[PDB]
Design a protein around this ligand. Sequence first.
Ligand SMILES: C[C@@H]1O[C@@H](O[C@H]2[C@H](O[C@H]3[C@H](O)[C@@H](O)[C@@H](O)O[C@@H]3CO)O[C@H](CO)[C@H](O)[C@@H]2O)[C@@H](O)[C@H](O)[C@@H]1O
Ligand SMILES: C[C@@H]1O[C@@H](O[C@H]2[C@H](O[C@H]3[C@H](O)[C@@H](O)[C@@H](O)O[C@@H]3CO)O[C@H](CO)[C@H](O)[C@@H]2O)[C@@H](O)[C@H](O)[C@@H]1O
Ligand SMILES: C[C@@H]1O[C@@H](O[C@H]2[C@H](O[C@H]3[C@H](O)[C@@H](O)[C@@H](O)O[C@@H]3CO)O[C@H](CO)[C@H](O)[C@@H]2O)[C@@H](O)[C@H](O)[C@@H]1O
Lengths: 310, 315
Amino acid sequence: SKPFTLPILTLGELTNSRFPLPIDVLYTNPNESAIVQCQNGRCTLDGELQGTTQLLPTGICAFRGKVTQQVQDEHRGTHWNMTVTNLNGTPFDPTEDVPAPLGTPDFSGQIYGVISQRNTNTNLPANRAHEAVIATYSPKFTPKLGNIQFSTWETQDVSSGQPTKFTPVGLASVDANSHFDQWTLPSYSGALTLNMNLAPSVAPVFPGECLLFFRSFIPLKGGYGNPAIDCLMPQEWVQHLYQESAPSLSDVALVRYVNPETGRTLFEAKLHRNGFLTVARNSAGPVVAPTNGYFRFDSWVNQFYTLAPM
Amino acid sequence: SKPFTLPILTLGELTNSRFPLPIDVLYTNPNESAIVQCQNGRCTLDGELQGTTQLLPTGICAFRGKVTQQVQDEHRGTHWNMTVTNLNGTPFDPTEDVPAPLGTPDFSGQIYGVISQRNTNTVPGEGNLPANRAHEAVIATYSPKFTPKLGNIQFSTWETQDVSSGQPTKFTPVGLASVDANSHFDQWTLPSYSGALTLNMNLAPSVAPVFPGECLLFFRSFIPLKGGYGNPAIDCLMPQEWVQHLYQESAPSLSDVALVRYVNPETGRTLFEAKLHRNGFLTVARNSAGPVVAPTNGYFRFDSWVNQFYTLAPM
Ligand SMILES: C[C@@H]1O[C@@H](O[C@H]2[C@H](O[C@H]3[C@H](O)[C@@H](O)[C@@H](O)O[C@@H]3CO)O[C@H](CO)[C@H](O)[C@@H]2O)[C@@H](O)[C@H](O)[C@@H]1O
Ligand SMILES: C[C@@H]1O[C@@H](O[C@H]2[C@H](O[C@H]3[C@H](O)[C@@H](O)[C@@H](O)O[C@@H]3CO)O[C@H](CO)[C@H](O)[C@@H]2O)[C@@H](O)[C@H](O)[C@@H]1O
Ligand SMILES: C[C@@H]1O[C@@H](O[C@H]2[C@H](O[C@H]3[C@H](O)[C@@H](O)[C@@H](O)O[C@@H]3CO)O[C@H](CO)[C@H](O)[C@@H]2O)[C@@H](O)[C@H](O)[C@@H]1O
């Protein structure tokens, strides 16, 4: 039976699985009232990708497809409808058992990035790129139906019928009108439809335990704020688990966060079969620990194992 | 000790180590006249990172630092100086034995992206939160003001005023501004990391085939353009996932060359074989330039270490 392992990457060698950002800090928030059910960065410990999770760091919150035409919308700016394909360019099949094309954003907000186009016709093709926003809460955000809408400040220089890429950069705003909520899923098929094929929600099941996240701070195009995106496992863990596909020998792996410059354990955590961490902590905020620390798998344990308090 | 391995990732599950892009195609160009000496995506088969290579996909062609002031420049646009730190926020020590801060671009061109800032000072009237701004920006890596090894670079914006001095600044790369004649895109020309007239140091070595009939094999990605005509590409010697894997495993190299097979897992047939050299690059026996037309679910599998007499089957 192939032994389970994690990569040996310090926090400073890890990236977020929910937006293309480095991991900045570990984080807890035991008083969170929302259901935690993100769809990117979801992988079981035996290597089964779930939700909208895919392997490419460049695929997270990215889209590929083609602009169809300019459209009108109450949002400020100039608006464009885009069909979306799979990230690899093949047509997205809405009958596949996924919530939306892999890589689709898994949160409500105004995602800021760059739309770029390289024309099919040429002898070299013409190109353009412009800043763009995708409001994932909009009724026109229908990636599971194969099309979305983005806005630009640019008033006309977006071509219809030409290959189009969205490169995410950050958020447009976090003011009240921009509806940023990292735990609110988009409605992938539109306003009044039920999302399907979701990766399950995650939660601690033992008193005294809370979720532990890998937190990244996300850029803003304007306004005030210090927004963050919390993932359950970094993208390199998704990639590693997918590769190894080690059988899970219990429902809970005990892992130790170790300072290698001393071999000392700073704290311990439970890494659950569905791909998330809990710790024994009764406070919210960052975990203050050196970023050369890393998680080391020590043994499979019973669900009723009591974690040493942080 | 540890057997050598490569990850099991198809072409469509790989990303470029020299720019944040998926791998699009395998590619050869036997007649290339330039010295191939890129500095990102450089890792020996026993896991030694070289050049300016680091592990984060988000770090490739990224910068972190602080805008110091607006500056004068003869070229069109508004120009800004920024100091750069290490990507982890610690001060860059110019005496370290690297060519430049890890992640620094390794080619000549106008790199297009977004500069974003999150202020250090917070506003009580805004909930004790900082002000933010982001704008499109271009970094001309051939400019005499591109001096990352000295701890600072210059970028240009279309925006004429709304970039703040003294505030934390991030550059997120997106593509190239142009590949017209005046934009000096050449993927094999290194920047002068310490400026005009200085010699670059601590470089990862150049790579080349040493056997007749062999040419380098690259993992090629097409890079976006802000404007103009072109279909520019960036070729890396190994994808970022291979850098990450080799660094983790640190498997001893048992010869100078690992024979690898590009396999189609559906049929289990080998499509071609290649030499994976100790310093971290591939060669194939091919006498043409252009893409390697193969399924994107194919992948390289380590076969065995080979000696200096092994001749590759032609593609
Ligand atoms: C705080 C400043 O933000 C930018 O100011 C621009 C301003 O941004 C607003 C956002 O667009 C809006 O969603 C909300 O978040 O409030 C922001 C202002 O607080 O938008 C106007 C146009 O309406 C201008 O573009 C302002 O420049 C940034 O540009 C400033 O430097 C400040 O950081
Ligand atoms: C940072 C420099 O930017 C350009 O020169 C600008 C010049 O910078 C001066 C600094 O302000 C000063 O602290 C000291 O370092 O001398 C610098 C060079 O004179 O400031 C003027 C102000 O009008 C212009 O903005 C210059 O463009 C660049 O040319 C230099 O090489 C430095 O990188
Ligand atoms: C081919 C068209 O490119 C863009 O046109 C914009 C134009 O881009 C020029 C680049 O700035 C220049 O480096 C060189 O590459 O030529 C390009 C034009 O071919 O720049 C002007 C401003 O000077 C306008 O912004 C043009 O719109 C693109 O916007 C067009 O849709 C075409 O693809």
